[PDB]
Amino acid sequence: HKSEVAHRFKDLGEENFKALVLIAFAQYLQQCPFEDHVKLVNEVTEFAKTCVADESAENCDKSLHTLFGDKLCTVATLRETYGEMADCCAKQEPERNECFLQHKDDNPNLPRLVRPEVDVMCTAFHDNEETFLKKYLYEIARRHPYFYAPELLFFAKRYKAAFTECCQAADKAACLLPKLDELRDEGKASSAKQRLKCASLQKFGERAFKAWAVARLSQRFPKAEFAEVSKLVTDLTKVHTECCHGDLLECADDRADLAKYICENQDSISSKLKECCEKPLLEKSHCIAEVENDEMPADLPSLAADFVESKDVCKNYAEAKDVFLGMFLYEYARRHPDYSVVLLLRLAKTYETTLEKCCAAADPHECYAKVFDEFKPLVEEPQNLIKQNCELFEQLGEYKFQNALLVRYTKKVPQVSTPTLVEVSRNLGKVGSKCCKHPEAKRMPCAEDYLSVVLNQLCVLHEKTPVSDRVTKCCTESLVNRRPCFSALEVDETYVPKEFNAETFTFHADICTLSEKERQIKKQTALVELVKHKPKATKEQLKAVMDDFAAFVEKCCKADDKETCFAEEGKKLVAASQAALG
Ligand SMILES: CCCCCCCCCCCCCC(=O)OC[C@H]1COP(=S)([S-])O1
Ligand SMILES: CCCCCCCCCCCCCC(=O)OC[C@H]1COP(=S)([S-])O1
Ligand SMILES: CCCCCCCCCCCCCC(=O)OC[C@H]1COP(=S)([S-])O1
């Protein structure tokens, strides 16, 4: 452990070094221009080469935290642009690093990234691949300062990948846009996931974390023994506390350590891990984290014998409540890779509650004999909601399913601003489209994965700008209750129709030719506004107005005077619609 900077440089290679160093700096020095970072990354890459050459070269023996910090404190911008972050520079490691970390801006205040036009991207990528890509890595990293830098990097490669394939196809646009689309969505899910995982530990607590991890691991590693699973829970629990409450390097090593452990112990954990364990170490923690579930062992006993029929049920649980509960979780989850983790947690909490009651009562065995019956309707409630929505998704297709949702949710919580309802409803559609393509057995974990981030960003947004007690309630509920709390929102009976504003419902020739996304958003925006303005309109009535709007758009995009048609036919569409909805 002589020269840490050389150790990493060799561990990572030059390409990954420079990328990670670029990200690391963009994440802390979020306002600085790209070229300033690129100079900081050269300076640091040049400097690191020496340490690979001569470990006893100067400064090469310094810790990474020290090097990184020294480097941050050299930037001329520091006090002017980052205020008190400059003050971290008067402190010594380890409090200097700690200080640098407390001052990172959760939400930078920056314009969004304009997806440029496909010509422009493919030309930049041809003309100057390095700068194109890295500039986008900086832009994303500065906008996502907590995003675990090696997770960013893995995205970048997929981007690059898409550009290689797509920048040389006939119809570049249609090779690439769906790839950019999926990647954008995945990238957001992924950053949102990480915010959720660190928030949820503070919020829901450590017992819940462990309960989540147990469930999750056990589905993935169903051949593993409770002992091995428990061990993994504990290290993963540590690992998450370091990645959430600590900095990059603590986390990377904590992660390489768990990965290393896992790869040494594969036969005790999973037969599915060999591809991952022969990845370069950087990718190794990631590949593991995304591995398929190992096959269940065959002929697994029913859980009745250990958890219901045994007369030691109350004794074994009392001896150690959490251990028995976790073993419950382990057994239930390894058998059910088809459940969301969170459903598995509802199940275990129902069991726990059932045991706290029954173990005190006159005849404990009799009282908890019906506990597995308590499970059926917990399991079947999300299996039925998936089925209903995926049937509907099939019928309507993504866009009209998003429109069905908008109406549903606008009537639920009509106080939510219109863009948020649009985004959220577009995102829920994207989730449907994603998860409904999986078979029934993979629907629930999928849904849990994306919904959990959709719903948590909704709650992060709404916390900032509360407009509903009902949304607050769902956002502050327990882990197991949040989603069912959302599913139980009803139509808001007390809401006062929004006032009519004719401009809102005016439309132009442009709507005929805008990009698909753009065109949808404008229509969906207006649909939200319509439900806000006419919240007691029936489905039949809203379909009538949407059928008219449809006919209006189709006519005015076939007209030769489009500008005139849109102002005149649209005047009349409005008038008709106002009379129709009283
Ligand atoms: C402001 C509007 C926000 C709307 C959010 C409403 C709740 C989302 C309902 C989505 C329907 C999809 C099916 C479904 O909910 O099941 C998902 C599984 C995954 O975790 P669980 S709680 S076991 O349920
Ligand atoms: C996944 C990569 C590493 C392997 C397992 C890591 C364990 C993750 C630790 C706990 C994460 C908790 C996040 C959470 O509480 O999710 C909220 C869910 C439950 O209902 P919904 S609203 S669908 O969202
Ligand atoms: C009563 C106040 C005035 C309201 C007049 C409102 C008419 C327009 C309302 C927004 C448009 C409804 C949303 C809608 O267009 O979606 C339906 C589908 C039908 O085919 P497309 S044109 S691809 O869009």
Numbering used by the authors: 3 to 584
Quote the paper.
The structure of HSA–Myr-2S-cPA, determined at the resolution of 2.26 Å in the P1 space group with two monomers of HSA in the asymmetric unit, reveals three unique binding sites of Myr-2S-cPA in each monomer. The identified binding sites of Myr-2S-cPA in HSA are: Drug Site 2 (DS2) of subdomain IIIA, fatty acid site 5 (FA5) of subdomain IIIB and the chamber created at the interface between domains II and III, which is formed in the elongation of Drug Site I (DS1) of subdomain IIA. Myr-2S-cPA/1 is located in the DS2 pocket, a typical binding site for more bulky molecules. The electrostatic interactions involve both sulfur atoms of the ligand, which are hydrogen bonded with the side chains of Ser342, Arg348 and Arg485. The aliphatic chain of Myr-2S-cPA/1 spreads across the big central chamber and anchors in the hydrophobic part of DS2. The aliphatic chain of Myr-2S-cPA/2 is anchored at the bottom of the FA5 via the van der Waals contacts with the side chains of Phe502, Phe507, Phe509, Leu532, Phe551, Leu575, Val576, and extends up to the entrance, where the polar head of the ligand is placed. The cyclic head of Myr-2S-cPA/2 is oriented alongside the side chain of Lys525 and forms two hydrogen bonds between its sulfur atoms and Nζ of Lys525. The Myr-2S-cPA/3 is bound in the site located at the interface of domains II and III, in the centre of serum albumin molecule. The terminal part of the aliphatic tail of Myr-2S-cPA/3 is placed in the central compartment of DS1 of subdomain IIA; however its central part and the polar head, after the passage between Trp214 and Phe211, crosses the normal boundaries of DS1 through a narrow tunnel to reach an additional chamber. Myr-2S-cPA/3 is not directly hydrogen bonded to the protein; however, there are water-mediated bonds created between the ligand and two waters.
As molecules of highly lipidic character found in the circulatory system, cPAs are bound and transported by the main extracellular lipid binding protein–serum albumin. Serum albumin is a three-domain helical protein which binds up to seven medium or long chain fatty acids (FAs). Here, we present the detailed interactions between human serum albumin (HSA) and equine serum albumin (ESA) with a derivative of cPA, 1-O-myristoyl-sn-glycerol-2,3-cyclic phosphorodithioate (Myr-2S-cPA). The crystal structures of the investigated albumin complexes show a different number and location of Myr-2S-cPA binding sites in both proteins, indicating a species-dependent manner of cPA binding.
